[PDB]
């Protein structure tokens, strides 16, 4: 390496994005064998140039160029023509948003690690910059955190912290154009603890009381410097929704705690996070989660019971079909072990049974009877079911009454009036009308009381249900009542086939018959029968449904007449197959 003809000042600068650069520039002899002076030289720059009238030749050797103010990202001026013409002398590289009181600033003493402090830089400055974390005990005073380039805001001190002992922090921020500090803060670290989270967690419940399980576990290493205050969240294996638990109900350090009033025999799954008693300091992460079932606990309420009664078999004995429904794994309170019906008759004598299915189908006589189904499990023992299956002649008597049946909202409903004195359960069966589908039925039982219910199978529309409502009083079932109702209608599918009867010299009578159940897809309100001629204006009448004929009236003598008549279900109509008659002369 040798020499560089001429220098500026210096090789590098520093752009304080609003001020003036004092540049000055060709040594004593490089100016000799090239033959110029301060003159010959320009302050060029890869477009136009530091105008002539702009420079100020310092001495028989210089060329000061000052500056506007300043205006973009980099910036590279030139003290780069050899009098005769044709200087690449030296040039530089200035730079282009100073300091910035660091903002925000918090610290956390994350249990386990050392104190840790965050903040916020501000706005993209653009002159690399150095954050430093401070501190002092006024007893003494501490080393300095100095951010990591690859995370220029975080920071961890590097002394173990010392709860109870106000402490002193503030971020000192630096870059090229003037250093500053932040806004001081003063704490007692024991207020920025974030505890590990509780752990080694367990659920139990084999105390054998079916409303509760009870969790328990392990407080965090910090148990012993601060006073824990928790939140046991917990939910049902397969909810999406975490229930919490009253936080005055979990207030200070502890290692156990029983939650209660849970569904019996279910799966539950709990989890907790705790932090320092009052609330002054970050809470911690949730401990793994833990499971647990609940007691079992007797089956709570009746199974559903009824019998059906085939037209006796071997003249005397009368077979009798008992059948009952299954408790929803929730009236069950645990696996169903096996049903049990006992049977009692004529003053004094009776055998029981233990069916493990649901149709007990027994033998039986012509006395009055009375049956009793219960349902047992790994604990009990199931509240009594109860029928009266009678002496062979017990008739009707008292039926329900004022019974409607209808739909909405996409749910079929039957409601009637609460009969006479006091029925001890209704038990309404029902099924679907259609030629080409015997009658298969459904049934539900219904607590005595009630008088409106939404039947519950899987039924269909355009399809038409028959619904019977039998009430059960003391000593048997009552004269039952029955009603039809589709659940949602379509407009018939087919449509009536017309046809005349007779025909005057103007005015003839007409004839149909019924859109047959399975094609109606609904309660046929009414018939519109409309008719035109060849010149074919048309017109029409509508007809009060019940009607099967008519009497198209004042027509022409010697006319071509064409018809076609639609039938309509609330839902709407569908005209039949046009048919064409014609008066005499």
Ligand X SMILES: *[C@@H]1O[C@H](CO)[C@@H](O[C@@H]2O[C@H](CO)[C@@H](O[C@@H]3O[C@H](CO)[C@@H](O[C@@H]4O[C@H](CO)[C@@H](O)[C@H](O)[C@@H]4O)[C@H](O)[C@@H]3O)[C@H](O)[C@H]2NC(C)=O)[C@H](O)[C@H]1NC(C)=O
Ligand Y SMILES: *[C@H]1O[C@H](CO)[C@@H](O[C@@H]2O[C@H](CO)[C@@H](O)[C@H](O)[C@H]2NC(C)=O)[C@H](O)[C@H]1NC(C)=O
Ligand Z SMILES: *[C@H]1O[C@H](CO)[C@@H](O[C@@H]2O[C@H](CO)[C@@H](O[C@@H]3O[C@H](CO)[C@@H](O[C@@H]4O[C@H](CO)[C@@H](O)[C@H](O)[C@@H]4O)[C@H](O)[C@@H]3O)[C@H](O)[C@H]2NC(C)=O)[C@H](O)[C@H]1NC(C)=O
Ligand U SMILES: *[C@@H]1O[C@H](CO)[C@@H](O[C@@H]2O[C@H](CO)[C@@H](O[C@@H]3O[C@H](CO)[C@@H](O)[C@H](O)[C@@H]3O)[C@H](O)[C@H]2NC(C)=O)[C@H](O)[C@H]1NC(C)=O
Ligand V SMILES: *[C@@H]1O[C@H](CO[C@@H]2O[C@@H](C)[C@@H](O)[C@@H](O)[C@@H]2O)[C@@H](O)[C@H](O)[C@H]1NC(C)=O
Ligand W SMILES: *[C@@H]1O[C@H](CO)[C@@H](O[C@@H]2O[C@H](CO)[C@@H](O)[C@H](O)[C@H]2NC(C)=O)[C@H](O)[C@H]1NC(C)=O
Q: Which residues pair with 95 in a beta bridge?
A: none
Q: Shortest gap between Cβ of 353 and ligand V (angstroms)?
A: 8
Return the residue matching tokens 């500090």.
181
CA gyration radius for the chain? 49
Q: Shortest gap between Cβ of 263 and ligand U (angstroms)?
A: 19
Q: Shortest gap between Cβ of 133 and ligand Z (angstroms)?
A: 12
Residue 359 within binding range of ligand U, rule CB under 6 A: no
Site size for ligand Y, by CB under 6 A?
7
Residue 568 within binding range of ligand X, rule CB under 6 A: yes
**What is the helix (H) or strand (E) element at residue 108, kind and residue range?**
strand 103-110
Q: Shortest gap between Cβ of 149 and ligand Y (angstroms)?
A: 34
Residue 516 partner contact from ligand W, ligand Z, ligand X, none using kind-dependent CB cut-offs of 5 to 8 Å: none
Residue 128 within binding range of ligand Z, rule CB under 6 A: yes
540 close to 493: Cβ distance less than 8 angstroms: no
Give me the torsion for CA of 364, 366, 367, 373, rounded to 10°. Answer: 30
532 close to 545: Cβ distance less than 8 angstroms: no
183 close to 112: Cβ distance less than 8 angstroms: no
Residue 59 within binding range of ligand Y, rule CB under 6 A: yes
- CA angle at 76 for the pair 70 and 79, rounded to the nearest 5°: 110
Residue 9 partner contact from ligand Z, ligand V, ligand U, none using kind-dependent CB cut-offs of 5 to 8 Å: none
234 close to 243: Cβ distance less than 8 angstroms: yes
Residue 541 partner contact from ligand Y, ligand X, ligand Z, none using kind-dependent CB cut-offs of 5 to 8 Å: none
Residue 340 within binding range of ligand V, rule CB under 6 A: yes
Residue 310 partner contact from ligand Z, ligand W, ligand U, none using kind-dependent CB cut-offs of 5 to 8 Å: none
Select from 144-152, 271-279, 419-427, 570-578 the region that touches ligand X (CB under 6 A): 570-578
DSSP characters for 504-535? -SS-BEEB-----HHHH-S-EEEEEE--B-SS
Cα–Cα distance between 187 and 117 in angstroms, integer?
12
In 208-360, where do the E strands start and end?
Answer: 213-216, 228-236, 256-259, 268-276, 305-308, 320-324, 338-343
Nearer to ligand U, 335 or 547 (CB): 335
Tokens linked to 487: 């659940």
Nearer to ligand X, 154 or 542 (CB): 542
Residue 352 partner contact from ligand X, ligand V, ligand U, none using kind-dependent CB cut-offs of 5 to 8 Å: ligand V
Query: Distance of CA 338 to CAs 28, 106, 302, 364, Å?
Result: 117, 65, 14, 23
Q: Shortest gap between Cβ of 183 and ligand W (angstroms)?
A: 40
Residue 356 within binding range of ligand V, rule CB under 6 A: no
Nearer to ligand X, 102 or 522 (CB): 522
Q: Shortest gap between Cβ of 409 and ligand X (angstroms)?
A: 13
Q: Site for ligand X (CB under 6 A): which residue of 269, 504, 571, 579?
A: 571
Residue 200 partner contact from ligand X, ligand W, ligand Z, none using kind-dependent CB cut-offs of 5 to 8 Å: ligand W
Q: Shortest gap between Cβ of 573 and ligand X (angstroms)?
A: 7
Residue 130 partner contact from ligand Y, ligand Z, ligand W, none using kind-dependent CB cut-offs of 5 to 8 Å: ligand Z
Residue 216 partner contact from ligand X, ligand V, ligand Y, none using kind-dependent CB cut-offs of 5 to 8 Å: none
Give residues 129-188 in contact with ligand Z (rule: CB under 6 A): 130, 146
Cα–Cα distance between 6 and 126 in angstroms, integer?
30
Residue 527 within binding range of ligand X, rule CB under 6 A: no
Residue 421's Cβ-count burial label (10 Å; 0-12, 13-18, 19+) is: exposed
- How far is CA 262 from its chain centroid? 23
Binding mask 13-32 for ligand Y (x = CB under 6 A): -------x---x--------
Report whether the peptide linkage leading into residue 151 is cis, meaning its omega lies within 30 degrees of zero.
no
Q: Site for ligand W (CB under 6 A): which residue of 141, 146, 148, 199?
A: 199
Cα–Cα distance between 355 and 373 in angstroms, integer?
10
Residue 298's Cβ-count burial label (10 Å; 0-12, 13-18, 19+) is: buried
Q: Site for ligand X (CB under 6 A): which residue of 51, 329, 572, 577?
A: 572
Cα–Cα distance between 579 and 79 in angstroms, integer?
109
Residue 397 within binding range of ligand V, rule CB under 6 A: no
Give residues 418-457 in contact with ligand W (rule: CB under 6 A): none
| Residue 180 three-state SS | strand
DSSP characters for 118-164? EEE--S--SS-EEEEE--B-SSSB---EE-BTTBSS--B--S---SS
Q: Site for ligand W (CB under 6 A): which residue of 54, 66, 106, 200?
A: 200
Strand 572-575 relative to strand 565-569: parallel, antiparallel, unpaired? Answer: antiparallel
Give me the torsion for CA of 29, 31, 36, 41, rounded to 10°. Answer: -160
Residue 570 partner contact from ligand W, ligand X, ligand U, none using kind-dependent CB cut-offs of 5 to 8 Å: ligand X
Q: Site for ligand X (CB under 6 A): which residue of 542, 562, 579, 582?
A: 542
Q: Site for ligand V (CB under 6 A): which residue of 258, 352, 493, 580?
A: 352
103 close to 97: Cβ distance less than 8 angstroms: no
Select from 170-178, 193-201, 333-341, 493-501 the region that touches ligand U (CB under 6 A): 333-341
Nearer to ligand Z, 128 or 538 (CB): 128
Residue 525 within binding range of ligand X, rule CB under 6 A: yes
Tokens linked to 329: 């794994």
From the list 262, 257, 269, 270, the residue with the least C-alpha distance to 296 is 262
From the list 274, 228, 216, the residue with the least C-alpha distance to 253 is 228
Residue 58 within binding range of ligand Y, rule CB under 6 A: yes
Q: Site for ligand U (CB under 6 A): which residue of 25, 117, 145, 336?
A: 336
Residue 490 within binding range of ligand X, rule CB under 6 A: no
Which residues would be at the binding site for ligand W (CB under 6 A)?
Answer: 199-200
Q: For binding to ligand Y (CB under 6 A), which residues are involved?
A: 20, 24, 58-59, 61-62, 69
Interface contacts to ligand V, rule CB under 6 A: 340, 342, 352
Residue ranges in contact with ligand Z by CB under 6 A? 128, 130, 146
Q: Which residues of this protein are in contact with ligand X, per CB under 6 A?
A: 525-526, 542, 568, 570-572
- Site residues for ligand U per CB under 6 A: 335-338, 356
């Amino acid at each position: 390496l040798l020499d560089p003809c001429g220098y500026i000042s210096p090789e590098s600068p520093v752009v304080q994005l609003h001020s003036n650069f004092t540049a000055v520039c060709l040594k004593e002899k490089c100016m000799d064998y090239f033959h110029v002076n301060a003159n010959y030289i320009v302050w060029k720059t890869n477009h136009f140039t530091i105008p002539k009238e702009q420079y100020t030749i310092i001495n028989r050797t210089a060329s000061s160029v000052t500056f506007t103010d300043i205006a973009s990202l980099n910036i590279q001026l030139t003290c780069n023509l050899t009098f005769g013409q044709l200087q690449n002398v030296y040039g530089i590289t200035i730079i282009s948003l100073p300091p910035e009181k660091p903002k925000n600033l918090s610290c956390i003493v994350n249990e386990g690690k050392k104190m840790r402090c965050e903040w916020d830089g501000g706005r993209e400055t653009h002159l690399e910059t150095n954050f430093t974390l401070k501190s002092e005990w006024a007893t003494h005073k501490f080393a300095d955190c100095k951010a990591k380039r690859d995370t220029p805001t975080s920071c961890t001190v590097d002394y173990s912290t010392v709860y109870f002992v106000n402490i002193e922090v503030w971020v000192e921020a630096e870059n090229a154009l003037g250093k500053v500090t932040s806004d001081h803060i003063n704490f007692d670290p024991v207020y920025k603890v974030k505890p590990n989270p509780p752990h080694n967690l367990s659920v139990i419940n084999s105390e054998e009381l079916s409303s509760i399980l009870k969790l328990t576990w392990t407080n965090p290493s910090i148990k012993s410097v601060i006073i824990l205050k928790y939140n046991i969240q917990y939910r049902t294996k397969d909810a999406s929704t975490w229930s919490q638990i009253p936080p005055e109900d979990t207030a200070s350090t502890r290692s156990s705690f029983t939650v209660q009033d849970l569904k019996p025999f279910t799966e539950y799954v709990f989890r907790i996070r705790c932090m320092k008693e009052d609330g002054k300091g970050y809470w911690s992460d949730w401990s793994e989660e833990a499971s647990g079932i609940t007691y079992e606990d007797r089956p709570s309420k009746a199974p559903s019971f009824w019998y059906k009664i085939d037209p006796s078999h071997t003249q005397g004995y009368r077979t009798v079909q008992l059948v009952w429904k299954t408790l929803p794994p929730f009236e069950a309170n645990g696996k169903i072990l096996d049903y049990e019906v006992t049977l009692t008759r004529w003053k004094s004598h009776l055998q029981n049974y233990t069916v493990n299915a649901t149709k007990l189908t027994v033998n039986l006589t012509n006395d009055r009877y009375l049956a009793t189904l219960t349902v047992r499990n790994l604990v009990g023992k199931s509240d009594a079911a109860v029928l009266t299956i009678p002496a062979c002649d017990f008739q009707a008597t008292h039926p329900v009454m004022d019974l409607k049946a209808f739909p909405k909202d996409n749910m079929l409903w039957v409601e009637w009036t609460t009969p006479r004195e006091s029925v001890k359960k209704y038990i309404l069966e029902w099924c679907v009308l259609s030629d080409k589908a015997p009658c298969i039925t459904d049934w539900q039982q219904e607590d005595g009381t009630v008088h409106r219910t939404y039947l519950r199978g899987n039924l269909a529309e355009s399809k038409c249900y028959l619904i019977t409502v039998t009430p059960v009083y003391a000593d048997g079932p009552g004269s039952p009542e029955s009603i039809k109702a589709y659940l949602k209608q379509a407009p018939p599918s087919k449509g009536p086939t017309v046809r005349t009867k007779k025909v005057g010299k103007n005015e003839a009578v007409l004839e149909w018959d019924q859109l047959p159940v399975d094609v109606q897809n609904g309660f046929i309100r009414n018939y519109t029968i409309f008719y035109r001629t060849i010149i074919g204006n048309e017109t029409a009448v509508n007809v009060d449904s019940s009607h099967t004929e008519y009497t198209l009236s004042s027509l022409t003598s010697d006319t071509l007449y064409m018809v076609r008549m639609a039938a309509y279900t609330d839902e709407g109509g569908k005209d039949g197959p046009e048919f064409t008659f014609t008066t005499p002369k």
